[PDB]
Point group: C6
Chain length 68, copies 6
């Protein structure tokens, strides 16, 4: 395929779908995708927006499927 990553992240950011972001160090982050660019995802929880490097993301698991 071509260009599935961005439609997927765009859907998460616009629809505010709850996600679980699994990092290569075993940490699981939870919140909503605020925004993203070439290298990072901005993830907002109850307290803070944190900057997650895509290079450290293994998988992003939405609470429900997004349609692209």
């Amino acid at each position: 395929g071509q260009m599935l990553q961005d439609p997927f992240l765009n859907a998460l950011a616009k629809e505010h779908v709850p996600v679980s972001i699994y990092l290569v160090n075993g940490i699981k982050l939870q919140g909503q995708v605020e925004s993203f660019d070439q290298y990072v995802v901005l993830l907002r929880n109850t307290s803070v927006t944190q900057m997650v490097y895509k290079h450290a993301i293994s998988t992003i698991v939405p609470a429900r499927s997004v349609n692209l």
Copy 2:
């Protein structure tokens, strides 16, 4: 060889072969390859389609071999 990755992923997706995706953190994901692009594989389980970064994939083990 040249361009074996995409034929492999395409065969999995079009023939709906169940796979095991082993990640660099030891997690094993299971389901169907829905689609893929330069950097990600969309993997569907019982519940949802999740986005897996290729950079975190160690190996993809199909339930049966593809053509």
Copy 3:
């Protein structure tokens, strides 16, 4: 989106917001972002400025959210 990484790091560096930098090896660094470039972040604690490779950063968690 496009070019969210640098506005985020710029805000941290100019406003000196305390951060927690989680590395791929599970180490958690704490201090303030002094400066950054394509590949590294300079993080200052009470004692020293250390040079952190972005490739080893999983997430950067500010003590409070920055506006970009």
Copy 4:
């Protein structure tokens, strides 16, 4: 040197030499190299051909040395 990787993998694939492929997660795969490209190695065991990402390979140890 220049372009030793491909002659090495070509010898394994054409001569079907048994290999042990050590991954960055400590997993050890065993079988024969079926084929390879820029990013992946196709490794066949008794049951199945699996697709191994080179980025996850630490070392490939043949059962005997190949000449290139």
Copy 5:
């Protein structure tokens, strides 16, 4: 910023500042930065100069801050 990595490594090498180099596998290396290029740092201990791949470096912690 732009091009802070090399000034940092150059200061360590020219001022002979002892460093701790933490690797992604948890190993901590100690000694002097001898030299560096696009991909590696040459680190000298008691005995030898070893070649460290930047891709395996998490952080470099100097014994004292550089200018």
Copy 6:
């Protein structure tokens, strides 16, 4: 600096200096550098020549310093 990696590996390969190659998975390989290219190092022990991906190498520690 510029182009220190190859002079270092060339010295190891031509002078056959015993090395210890530490991998990101904690494995320590021992032997001599046979050859190398952009992406791999061919390391020979008593039994076999194995192909090591540079991306999985943390550090290469020679038994004695090489002069470049």
